[PDB]
């Protein structure tokens, strides 16, 4: 959120491109923003705002905002403290932090920071190794398993191909693949008491099947435009998906959230909470832990401002706002 | 209306930005104009135009045009004569002038200019002080209380933050805050016989509740894009709101009105009248009282021209025009 | 149709602006083109094209194309031969030519060129003088009275105001105003056996009333964007109007026709024929009579090409084509 | 697919324009791309991808991808090996190749390359010569007759007119016209056992009549924007056409396909397969046979990538994907 310039200044171009890029022609990356910009909120007036609160309860825990840090791999690419800097700032802000399967600091180290860590799973070739990663995350105190379900394999990121981009030798997968199926979801659900959250759902019937499968939540998402190029933005499917699950699981959304007003739009369309990816990495690149803290404080102020201006004393009230496309 | 250049020439940049700016990304500021530009009128032909009149009756009084000067705070920012220059030109044009709570000349001085002064209220922390301001306005001969209902607090105007903009010491609140609620509306309605007009309504159910609450009018408005960034333009809610109140109160609109054709569009969508904000301040900056007089004469000619070209001998006929979105 | 550059090269700027301009912000001028560009034809294949003909019968006479030259005042502004050059080229092409009330050569001189002259009427202050002009036109052999019904007064053409544009002394109204009403239409209809064609109809109920009033035709038109700024383009009202009159009169359209493909679009939306204004004046400015001849030959080839490519052996078949908005 | 630059580098400008251009204002050429860009796919997740296959069965034969090389005349314009280079690369990729009536190498030479040759027919003035060409194609082992039905005559390609473009003397119609009708279709169908595929259908009723006429397939197509300027893109008619024929023939589409994601969009809208024209010629110009091979390998990888990311193990599954317009 205007820290993007600072991050472009400091990062090597090919790392900036790894962060910023999408797959193919980047149509789905651009559409995430276009779709949000077409949504207008219809605010309410003259309601009691004596106790405006941005807090929510999600997956058994209070969060300070309806927002979590999205899983983004290899955060030491952006700053030497990598995941620890981001997790510390998230903890201090009361925001859940999603630890990656491909984190550049081990999941146990990040969980020891405290806060509310979730763990994002990629399915390994091996049910047994997959479930061992889930068990590690649970043993370390992670509070939810965010199972990424839109990466049978990685999308074609043409910026990275044009750059011949590769992991610097000083960045590794500190926790150390086969396509996940509904059978994999069931194996995870049977082996943990943590809520299983399926990230990357766009079809209404997949959202309904996720509830039937025992998911505790879904993230309506086209993976920041990095997977199928031409995949619909999650924000365009969110309202239909929220209606189809009719309260059967938490429904989160991501893709393009860049302000507290955008958070308000997502909640007015029915989201329980959003994920935020690239902006958190911009803040990390620009100023480390303190950069991420400042970003989360700015987003917190913007969310409180937008809610009150729209007559909403709580996130639940914001979910009852109506919208109009423009 | 092309006086904007002259105003940019003369004003200090940070004052020009205070006037021109909106909140956040300015999406709602831009949308006010985009929304008007999508409306096309379907004109009628061959009707009697022997006595074309732009006059309306509103809040017990004749007005020369279906237009009033919007409340804009601190008009000495734009010209040394500030509010007195604008109120004199409005009086001479037969246009109501809305005196601000944050006027830079006292409300009694502006009311003494004559004309048809309305008074815009911000709710004070203190029902008693709020009602004393209403009583001052009524004692001074103001004809309507325009209660602003979309500012529980001021929006985030990033131009002003980037400029570190502050009131020059030579500008003060010459009449000298807590969020207004429906209880505040009732307190005002019980304490005045003047029509109470709620400015900043966008939701249909808030317009219906305003009628139920005893409002004499509403202004369908997103506050010139200065409050919630992402709030729908008033012009996009106007037709639905006019249908929902079904004549129970006057329905005004503002945001982006820049020509007599725009006034015609608003009336064809059902508005009783419009407010005009920034253009009046451009005229004031460019040429003081005579600048505002010339602006109002130009708008008067454009409204008469547009009405007649659309076959409308009266504003009521213009409200029966149909429109098409393009 | 790419002769516009040549015309801009040769004409004085203020005359070019008189020709090219619209009223107000020119929104309706631009919308005439935008609206045509959104229409796509659904062509038919494999039909018999052995005898493709672009001819139509209109107002009792065969025309070589479904097109007439629109009334454009003061054509000596564009070329020394003015109206005679255009009328000669129209005659030779088999296209009707509309003589203006404000022609710069007398209506009797232009009618003597031959061809199929129509006469465009502006209502004079005086029913008697108005009807005398109609009688002159009929005596001279004009075949239709094109009564302009969208000019109670002239629109505000800001290019001309900025230019301080006035008629050169070498251009006069060689045939030598009060707002026309439905009473005026009836006076004309009672005083001529020629078909009366009302030019400037946009509302469906005005098209139905025109049939009830005894009009032989209407021109669905916003006057090339020169009258009400913000008036809907005629092409956007054409289909609804054609359905409402259900064959009760001829329905023509104008505004922005710049190719034979555009003629095909208008006919697929239901027009009996189009008028063409500015392009004919470009051709006249660029190369006089021979310029207009070349323009009409190009339009004739483009209309025949478009019809055949869309599977239409006749203009009637083209009116049965379907369209899709894009 | 980014080989377009290389082709522009090497080809003479007027040959590049012959390849790239459309008719008229090129509205239909541009719309082919705009229309695809508005389509978003709704991908499915968590399905079995153990045996993803891009193969289809069409006109009695397996094809490696749901794609064929479109008929493009005079390929020696782009490279000295012309049609033989393209047909060899198509054969090696398992893609059908459409031999043109106006090929610059004889149809028997191209068919002898092997692979799966189809033959595109233009109707000759002479049923007997037309049917002799069909018999030549069948005798040579072509597997389908692609009867072009949208060229009663060639469209007006203004780039070629402005260039005064003509065939170099070193390029000839190595196989050596009157408008085709439904009678011509029947003559072809009665004289061959090969499937007859009507290329250039856009109207729903023409697609239904094609099935009734005994066509084995249709290509929903506006001829790459080269025939009627203003013709709807095929991709905008495809879904309605697929529903109307309800499995009665194969339904192909072309126009603007530039990636495997675009192939996925076409199949999600119901196409059995696509044709690809200009990109194959870019590859041929840039690098001959090996250029076309590399293009087809890239398209094959992109189609497999897009299918799997959208949860589709087969092309049939991709046809059951839903889409949303954006
Ligand atoms: C560099 C980068 C790496 C990853 C790695 C992962 C990952 O190992 N697992 C996963 O499940 N999602 C990922 N993502 C998607 C992310 O979690 C959000 O879906 C989008 O970034 C939301 O959009 P923005 O807020 O970024 O627009 C990534 C996004 C970016 C930019
Ligand atoms: C500098 C500036 C100050 C104020 C202060 C106030 C205010 O103390 N009370 C209120 O109730 N409305 C205000 N407004 C909104 C105004 O009354 C109109 O809502 C919009 O200006 C209509 O849009 P434009 O005609 O300007 O597009 C302002 C608008 C501008 C530009
Ligand atoms: C310079 C100029 C003068 C006139 C004078 C007249 C007029 O004395 N009577 C009338 O009834 N219509 C007029 N018109 C409108 C014209 O008849 C067509 O309605 C539009 O030009 C159609 O649009 P284009 O083909 O020009 O887009 C004019 C148009 C132009 C440009
Ligand atoms: C230079 C050029 C020549 C021809 C000659 C023919 C032809 O003798 N017969 C036919 O039946 N279609 C043709 N076409 C259309 C082609 O078959 C495809 O319909 C479009 O090229 C699809 O669009 P793109 O993939 O090109 O967008 C051509 C296209 C181009 C560009
Ligand atoms: O999932 C991703 O989007 C991503 O960019 C990525 C790249 C490498 C490893 C893991 C994730
Ligand atoms: O209400 C407003 O929009 C506004 O700009 C303002 C700013 C300072 C004081 C009062 C109003
Ligand atoms: O009718 C017109 O549009 C027009 O431009 C005009 C101007 C002067 C005289 C007559 C018509
Ligand atoms: O069919 C075509 O589009 C085309 O361009 C063409 C041109 C010359 C000969 C054959 C086809
Ligand atoms: Mg996001
Ligand atoms: Mg306004
Ligand atoms: Mg026209
Ligand atoms: Mg194609």
Q: Smallest CA–CA separation between D192 and chain C, in Å?
A: 19
Q: Which residue in B2, B33, B44, B46 has the most chain C C-beta atoms within 10 A of its own C-beta, making it the best mutation to test that interface?
A: B46
- The DSSP 8-state label assigned to residue A248 in this structure reads S
CB-ligand 7 contact for C102 (6 Å cutoff): yes
- Structure token digits, residue B88: 């004199």
Nearest residue to B211 (alpha-carbon basis) of B180, B251, B179? B251
Sign (positive or negative) of CA dihedral D125, D127, D130, D136: negative
The residue assigned the tokens 């630890």 is A99
CB-ligand 4 contact for D70 (6 Å cutoff): yes
Inter-chain contact A37–B27, Cβ cutoff 8 Å? Answer: yes
* Ligand 2: centre distance to CA B275 (Å): 9
Alpha-carbon dihedral of residues A212, A213, A214, A220, nearest 10 degrees? -90
Query: Ligand 4 pocket: which of D23, D104, D224, D260 to mutate (most atoms <8 Å of CB)?
Result: D224
Kindly list the partner chains of chain D, i.e. chains with 3 or more CB atom pairs below 8 Å: A, C
Sign (positive or negative) of CA dihedral A309, A315, A316, A318: positive
Helical H segments across D164-259, by residue range: 182-190, 204-212, 234-245
Which uninterrupted H or E stretch holds D248? none
Q: Please measure the distance between the N-terminal and C-terminal CA atoms of chain B and give it in whole angstroms.
A: 23
Contact predicate C33/D193, CB 8 Å? no
How many Å apart are CA B323 and CA C9, to the nearest integer? Answer: 39
Q: Residue D27: helix, strand or coil by DSSP?
A: helix
Inter-chain contact C152–B37, Cβ cutoff 8 Å? Answer: no
Q: Hey, whose CA ends up nearest to atom 3 of ligand 7?
A: C226
Residues 6+ apart with CB under 8 A from D55: D62, D63, D64, D65, D315
- How many H-runs (helices) and E-runs (strands) does chain A carry? 13, 12
Compute the residue count for chain D.
Answer: 326
Q: Is domain A3-325 in CATH 3.20.20.70, yes or no?
A: yes
Contact predicate B143/B152, CB 8 Å? no
Contacts of C259 in chain D (CB under 8 A): 24-25, 229
CA distances to B40, B41, B43, C236 from B265, in Å: 7, 6, 11, 17
Between β-strands B322-325 and B39-42, what pairing exists: parallel, antiparallel or unpaired?
Answer: antiparallel
User: Phi first, then psi: what are they for B68, rounded to 5°?
Assistant: -135, 160
How many Å apart are CA D113 and CA D104, to the nearest integer? Answer: 15
Q: List for chain B the helix, strand, coil content (%; round to 5).
A: 45, 15, 40
Closest approach atom of ligand 1 to CA A258: 25
Q: Which of A79, A116, A157, A223 is catalytic?
A: A223
CA distances to A109, A224, B58, B195, D265 from B90, in Å: 69, 53, 16, 20, 59
CA distances to B60, B84, C35, C269 from B113, in Å: 19, 7, 49, 58
Least distant ligand from the CA of D98: 4
Q: Which residues of C are known catalytic residues?
A: 223
Maximum CA pair distance of chain A? 58
* Ligand 10: centre distance to CA B255 (Å): 4
Nearest to A232 among D41, D46, D49 (CB): D41
Nearest to D49 among A179, A202, A232 (CB): A179
Contact predicate D152/C308, CB 8 Å? yes
How many Å apart are CA C92 and CA C300, to the nearest integer? Answer: 12
How many Å apart are CA A126 and CA A178, to the nearest integer? Answer: 8
Contact predicate C285/C11, CB 8 Å? yes
| Sequence-distant contacts of B10-15: CB under 8 A, at least 24 apart | B10/B285, B10/B286, B11/B78, B11/B285, B13/B163, B14/B160, B14/B163, B14/B165, B15/B77, B15/B78, B15/B165
Inter-chain contact B229–A42, Cβ cutoff 8 Å? Answer: no
Kindly list the partner chains of chain C, i.e. chains with 3 or more CB atom pairs below 8 Å: B, D
How many Å apart are CA C55 and CA A130, to the nearest integer? Answer: 76
How many Å apart are CA A144 and CA A217, to the nearest integer? Answer: 10
| Cα nearest neighbour of B41 on chain C | C231
- Structure token digits, residue A299: 């987003």
HEC letters along chain C: CCCHHHHHHHCCHHHHHHHHCCCCCCHHHHHHHHHHHHEEEECCCCCCCCCCCCCEEECCEEECCCEEECCCCCHHHCCCCHHHHHHHHHHHHCCCEEECCCCCCCHHHHHHCCCCEEEEECCCCCHHHHHHHHHHHHHCCCCCEEEECCCCCCCCCHHHHHHCCCCCCCCCCCCCCCCCCHHHHHHHHHCCCCCEEEEEECCHHHHHHHHHCCCCEEEECCHHHCCCCCECCHHHHHHHHHHHHCCCCEEEECCCCCCHHHHHHHHHCCCCEEEECHHHHHHHHHHHHHHHHHHHHHHHHHHHHHHHHCCCCCHHHHHCCEEEEC
Inter-chain contact C40–D232, Cβ cutoff 8 Å? Answer: yes
**What is the CB-side half-sphere exposure of residue D137 using CA atoms within 13 A?**
32
CA C247 vs. chain centroid, Å, equals 20
CA distances to B96, B223, B281, B286, B293 from B76, in Å: 19, 20, 10, 13, 17
How many Å apart are CA A134 and CA D270, to the nearest integer? Answer: 40
Q: Rounded to the nearest 5 degrees, what angle is found at the Cα of B265, between the Cα atoms of A35 and C271?
A: 85
Q: Which residues of B are known catalytic residues?
A: 223
CA distances to A273, C208, C221, C240, C251 from C246, in Å: 55, 9, 19, 10, 10
Inter-chain contact B181–A46, Cβ cutoff 8 Å? Answer: yes
Sign (positive or negative) of CA dihedral B159, B162, B168, B169: positive
Contact predicate B75/B104, CB 8 Å? yes
Nearest residue to C8 (alpha-carbon basis) of C282, C258, C287? C282
Q: Hey, whose CA ends up nearest to atom 7 of ligand 5?
A: A73
How many Å apart are CA D84 and CA B313, to the nearest integer? Answer: 75
CA distances to B143, B177, B203, B251, D309 from B122, in Å: 17, 7, 20, 20, 55
Contact predicate C180/C123, CB 8 Å? yes
Compute the residue count for chain C.
Answer: 326
How many Å apart are CA A303 and CA A296, to the nearest integer? Answer: 10
- The DSSP 8-state label assigned to residue B311 in this structure reads T
Helical H segments across D94-229, by residue range: 107-112, 127-139, 158-163, 182-190, 204-212
| Cα nearest neighbour of B28 on chain A | A40
Nearest to D46 among A180, A236, A237 (CB): A180
Q: Smallest CA–CA separation between D44 and chain A, in Å?
A: 6
Contact predicate B308/B101, CB 8 Å? no
Residues 6+ apart with CB under 8 A from B120: B71, B98, B99, B100, B101, B146, B147, B148, B199
Closest approach atom of ligand 6 to CA B71: 1
Contact predicate C99/C83, CB 8 Å? yes
Closest approach atom of ligand 1 to CA A70: 17
Q: Hey, whose CA ends up nearest to atom 3 of ligand 6?
A: B226
Contacts of B237 in chain A (CB under 8 A): 42, 324
Q: Residue B23: helix, strand or coil by DSSP?
A: coil
Report resolution in angstroms: 1.5
Q: Please measure the distance between the N-terminal and C-terminal CA atoms of chain A and give it in whole angstroms.
A: 23
Nearest residue to B312 (alpha-carbon basis) of B41, B68, B93? B41
How many Å apart are CA B197 and CA B186, to the nearest integer? Answer: 12
CA distances to A243, B90, C256, D15 from C294, in Å: 62, 57, 19, 29
List, as ranges, residues with CB under 5 A of the ion ligand 12.
Answer: D 254, 257, 276
- Structure token digits, residue C204: 């469906």
Residues 6+ apart with CB under 8 A from A80: none
Nearest residue to A277 (alpha-carbon basis) of A58, A1, A39, A12? A1
CA distances to C139, C319, C321 from C314, in Å: 33, 9, 11
| Cα nearest neighbour of D47 on chain A | A181
Contact predicate C228/C28, CB 8 Å? yes
Nearest residue to D44 (alpha-carbon basis) of A188, A23, A182? A182
How many Å apart are CA D121 and CA D188, to the nearest integer? Answer: 10
**What is the CB-side half-sphere exposure of residue C310 using CA atoms within 13 A?**
34
Contact predicate D228/C43, CB 8 Å? yes
Nearest to C180 among B46, B264, B322 (CB): B46
Closest approach atom of ligand 2 to CA B98: 17
* Ligand 7: centre distance to CA C7 (Å): 19
Which uninterrupted H or E stretch holds D66? none
Contact predicate C168/C189, CB 8 Å? no
Q: Please measure the distance between the N-terminal and C-terminal CA atoms of chain D and give it in whole angstroms.
A: 23
Between β-strands C145-148 and C117-121, what pairing exists: parallel, antiparallel or unpaired?
Answer: parallel
Strand ranges inside B28-77, DSSP E: 39-42, 56-58, 61-63, 67-69
How many Å apart are CA D22 and CA D161, to the nearest integer? Answer: 12
Ordered DSSP codes for B75-142: GGGT-TTHHHHHHHHHHHHT--EEE-TT-SS-HHHHHHT-S-EEEEEPPPSSHHHHHHHHHHHHHTT-
Buried b (16+ CB within 10 A) or exposed e, C16-55: bbbbbbbbbbbbbbebbbebbbebbbbbbbbbebeebebe
* Ligand 9: centre distance to CA A82 (Å): 19
> What residues in chain C have their Cβ under 8 A from chain B's Cβ atoms?
24-25, 27-28, 31, 34-35, 149-150, 152-153, 155-156, 179-182, 184-185, 198, 200-203, 205-206, 227-233, 236-237
Method by which this entry was solved: X-ray
Contact predicate D260/D280, CB 8 Å? no
How many Å apart are CA A304 and CA A261, to the nearest integer? Answer: 9
CB-ligand 5 contact for A173 (6 Å cutoff): no
């Amino acid at each position: 959120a205007d820290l993007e310039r600072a991050a472009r200044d400091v990062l090597p171009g090919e790392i900036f491109d790894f962060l910023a890029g999408g797959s193919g022609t980047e149509a789905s990356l651009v559409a995430n923003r276009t779709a949000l910009e077409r949504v207008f909120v219809i605010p309410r007036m003259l309601r009691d705002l004596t106790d405006v609160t941005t807090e929510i309860d999600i997956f058994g825990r209070r969060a300070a905002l309806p927002m979590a840090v999205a899983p983004v791999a290899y955060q030491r690419l952006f700053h030497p403290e990598g995941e620890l800097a981001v997790a510390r700032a998230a903890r201090d802000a009361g925001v859940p932090y999603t630890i990656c399967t491909l984190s550049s600091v081990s999941l146990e180290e990040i969980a020891a920071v405290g806060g509310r860590p979730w763990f994002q799973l990629f399915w390994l070739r091996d049910e047994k190794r997959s479930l061992d990663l889930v068990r590690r995350a649970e043993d370390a105190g992670c509070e939810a398993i965010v199972f990424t379900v839109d990466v049978p394999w990685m999308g074609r990121r043409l910026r990275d191909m044009r750059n011949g981009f590769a992991l610097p030798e000083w960045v590794t997968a500190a926790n150390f693949f086969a396509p996940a199926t509904w059978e994999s979801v069931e194996a995870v659900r049977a082996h943990t008491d943590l809520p299983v959250v399926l990230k990357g759902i766009l079809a209404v019937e997949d959202a309904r099947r996720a509830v039937d499968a025992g998911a505790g939540g879904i993230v309506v998402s086209n993976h920041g435009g990095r997977q199928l190029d031409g995949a619909v933005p999650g924000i365009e499917m969110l309202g239909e998906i929220v209606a189809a699950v009719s309260g059967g699981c938490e429904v989160l959304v991501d893709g393009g959230i860049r302000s507290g007003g955008d958070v308000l739009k997502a909640t007015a369309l029915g989201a329980s909470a959003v994920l935020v990816g690239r902006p958190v990495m911009w803040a990390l690149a620009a100023a480390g832990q303190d950069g991420v803290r400042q970003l989360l404080e700015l987003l917190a102020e913007e969310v409180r401002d937008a809610m009150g201006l729209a007559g909403c004393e709580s996130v639940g009230a914001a979910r009852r706002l109506n919208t109009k496309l423009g």
